[model samples]
Structures are given as C-alpha cells and as structure tokens.
Target: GEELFTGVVPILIELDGHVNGHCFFVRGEGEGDATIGKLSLKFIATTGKLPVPWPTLVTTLVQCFSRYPDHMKRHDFFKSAMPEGYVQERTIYFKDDGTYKTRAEVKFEGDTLVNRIELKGIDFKEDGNILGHKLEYNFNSHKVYITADKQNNGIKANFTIRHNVEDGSVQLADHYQQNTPIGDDDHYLSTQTILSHMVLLEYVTAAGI
Candidate 1:
C-alpha cells in the first residue's frame, strides 16, 4: 500500500469487496465455500473530524466531489478502498470547515447533520447480546460516530459506541454526550475518537476472508 491515507495507520484485514475507514473484507476470486468468508474492520483514532486530516480529505475529494456520471472518484472512498466489494450507497462531502471528509451516513432528521452512524450487518441476536464464542460468526461491526448537534467552541464530546447484537443496530451507548475541545487539548470527543478507532482495528483483524 502506498500510504493510502496520510497519518493513517493501516489495520491489516481485507474484506471481500470494499474498504472504509481503513477496513474491508477479503474473498477468493471465485464463488462457493472455497471463498474465504470474512469481514474486515479498520479505523483510526484522531483528534479531528475527518480521518487522517483535512488535507487528505481534500486530496481524495477533489477527484470525487460531485455525484455526476463519469466523475473520476464518484463516492470513491469505499470504491477505491475495496475495489471488489458491493457499494450499496455512500455519500461524502465537505463540511463548512472548507475540508472534504468521508463519514458513515447515519439517518438524518430535518435540516440537521447526525454525525453518528449506524450499521446493519448480519449480527443480530436476541437482547442485542453477542456471545463471546459467536463474535466472528456474527460478522457484525459498527462505525463510530458523533451526533449532529455538536458545534464549534465547545468543551468536549463523550460517547460510547455500542453494538446491538440482537438487532444488528449500532447506537450511542447510554450516558454518552458529544462535545468539542479547544486549543488542541484532548477531551471527551477526542478520547472517544481514539477508542472508536482502536475498536475498528480489532474488527478488521477479526474479519476473515
């Protein structure tokens, strides 16, 4: 890999077709059980909103901004990340901060940005509990995210990323709030970002292909 994303640490794990937030699945060239089935989870903890940084997002986005046909990068974050995976749907754009960013698309309310994302993988168990022995078999992982309400000049955001194994839903664990920090001092959001990325790496490692 030629430094796919600057300032990004690659967590090794290849998913079947696409790579997002540093993770993708791996599959054999042909069909059938011979194809090693696995899901890859990759992520990075950062102090900023975009993975890597504003500069990297800018570079990746220049080639992919509009949703026009023949656009060189047409939502290519996932496409380029995993060349052979299924791209059901994806949307990435620049925030008002004058930088391009890739993020998981959580359901949105009227005129607001819900920064937190939800995953609906095939890992649903009753009561949302995933047994330790069935972790890999479930093939369930979620992308960590912040709520749409966070804004500038705030203290910090504190939130726990939780997976609902029973429903295969990813949601904000109870008692977690979103906030922003000033002057480069790490706070709730920053800390949670790091933790989220760490968990992402683990998911990737467990994904078998």
Candidate 2:
C-alpha cells in the first residue's frame, strides 16, 4: 500500500542453471518484443602474495657490504674462501708471501684447477663495468673471472690476485699478462683486494652464506 513496487518498477531474481534457456527483457526498447540484451560479470584470479619491489630489494642487498673492510693485513687474508665440498678441484693455492703455494693436481704440461670456486647471484663492478654478475675463482692461476649479464654487453673479464714473497704485498689485476713482473709492485697486480672482496661479499650475501 505504501510503495506498490515504486510505481510499477520490477526486480527479478533467477536461479536457473541452464545457460541458454533463461528469459530476460528490456522494457523501453520495443513494443514488448521478445529480444534481449546481456550483462555478464566475471572475476580474475591473482596470486595472494605480492612480490617484493625490485628496486628496494636490490638496494638492501647492495648495502649489506657497506661496512665490510676494503683493506686488511696480508696475513689476515684467506688461504682459501670457498663453500663446503669445493676442495677437490683446487689446482693451486697462494701463500702469504707468495711463491707458488701448492700444485695440487699436476699434469704433464701444467696443472688444472677447474671450478675452484663458482658463485652466482652477485653484483660485481669495476671501472663501472660489471653490475650484478656471477664470479669464479681459479686457484691454479690465481685468477678471478667476472661474468656480466648476457642481455646487456655479454662481456667477461679475468683478474688475478697474487702476493710478493719478498715484499709481503698482495695485488689484484685486470689482466694476467705474460712477462709481467710476478710481484714487483711495478708492472704488477694493481687492483685492490678490498674491491675483490666486495664482489665475493655480494655473492655470499645473496646466497645467505
């Protein structure tokens, strides 16, 4: 008595499961014609957990090594810094004052130390070259290999860290040239050990080791 369907307006609810047999209407379109229009509703699915923002995650990871020492006493350096179960492939080692430390797996021509230390999930940079890369250390040659993302430059470089037995100094190099003075501080390894550690630290931080 008070509303009376609000002056003849209609609201209908249908529960029929049949998709093709449901009947519907539009009141103002035609002369009571049996044609119809459709309205559909759908829901999209998505992951319940949101992903961490890449920029924030990367900043946090890089800052992890901000407090690490870049310079340290040569005696404090590691004879080896490798993960567990990585011993079998070591071909050589470096002593504090550097002569050839050890020749582990010797052969006719020379020795081979494959995969002495292989690390992934690291960001290594030198002269603004590498950014977020993988690194490898070959003890036999006292060489460190840095690999860049293939999507970018697809570049790789070799570096070495060696010690001088007489001077008791350690050096890092961008290249291991032949006829180079093995330990003279001139024409010798010039890269810094601290920066090298930065590369290793990145891997360790990301790997949670």
Candidate 3:
C-alpha cells in the first residue's frame, strides 16, 4: 500500500513562473499513466555574456554537487567533497549534497525560482500569476533546454514533464517531446532518462494507475 511517491515535486517546467527547476520527483507506476522513479536535474543561471561555467553555473542552480566524484582515503575529496557558502535571498540553507534540502528561497534571471520556493502545501501560484513549463538550457534559441544552447556548467533542472488530459474528454493518442534535452555518455539523453523513468515499471500500483 506504499507505491513510492517521493517529494520535492514542482513539475511546472516553465511558462510564467519563469524559472522552475526544483528537482526530485520520484513517482513510479509505468507508462500508460504515471512513471519516473528516481531522478535528479538542475542547471540554470545563464543570461548573457555567452561563456558558461560560472562557479559551476550559479552552483548548479544553487547547490547540490556530489553526483559523481572519486575522492579517496575515506572520501576526503576537498573535506568530504565540495562545500562552500554565501547564498542570500530570503535565505534558509541546510543542504548536504542536494535536496528539496528544505527549499523556500530566492534567485532568478531566467524564470524566478518558483515563487521563491515555499514547499509546504505545494502551491506554485497558478490561478494568480504563474504559468511555468520551460527550462531554457543555453546558446540563444529559447524554449526549454538541457544540452547547452552554447555552453553551461551546471544549475539544476527537473523533468520539464508535460501532459494534462483532464477535461478534454480524452483523445491523446500520441504527442511527446515538450522540449526536454541533455547528453553526456552515449546519449538520447540517456535514453530519455531511461524512457522517462522506465515509462512502465510496476512494483505496486492501484487506485487507478
């Protein structure tokens, strides 16, 4: 009776909220409905000047490094791997290597950091002044991004997932690619992030999956 529904979700990629990349949305079931069990993305802070990699692109959208390192001697890679400071904007920090690390802060340029984050009752403000659903990678040509528009080091971005078939009376046979992109090793964006989290992997499902 517990089919995995982790936290820190805010799939409002970008539309009006301007910048939305809160990361961590593990909801599993299997394609045909809800899928994506285990994920992590972040990368932003690119306005002009054209040469990415500034303090690792605004510290990977703030902070959350330690994805893949190779520190030895009981893991002493720069004092337990990357740890720096200074993040002002209605502050609240406790990050270890990543998080919903207890969000609700501020930082913007591309979208606006989702109402300056306030993850408590999940209300990114829509019926008000927000339209989120865009990620904008880099280069120049705007509209949701991943694989450097020109050059980027990091920032942090979520799925950018899209699909709302609620009051249309159904009829969505096929229509994917809401403009998600990326690459590093033998890409296809790592096979669509493993087919969008395996698009269909069940270990538990019920309650209308």
lDDT of 2 by residue, 2-100 (tens): 111112111111111111222211111101100111111111112221121111111111011111122321211111111111121111112211111
Candidate 3 lDDT over 68-170, as tens digits, reads 2222222211112122211212111211111112232222223212223222112233321122222222111112122212233222222222222233221
For candidate 3, the lDDT comes to 0.21
- Name the regions of candidate 3 deviating beyond 4 angstroms: 1-82, 85-144, 147-160, 168-209
lDDT of 1 by residue, 1-209 (tens): 11232222212321221123332222111111101112123333233232122111111111111121232222223213221221122222211111112223211123221223222223223222221211111222332222323254322223233322334533232222222321222211111112222232111111101
**Clash count of each predicted structure:** 20, 3, 27
Ranking of predictions according to lDDT: 1, 3, 2
Q: In candidate 2, how many Å is residue 13 off?
A: 83
Candidate 3: residue 102 Cα off by (Å) = 14
- Top-lDDT structure, candidate number: 1
**TM-score (C-alpha) between model 2 and the true structure:** 0.15
After aligning candidate 2 to the native by TM-score, how far in Å is the CA of 89 from where it should be? Answer: 23
RMSD values, in order shown: 18.8, 32.5, 18.0
For model 1 the TM-score comes to 0.19
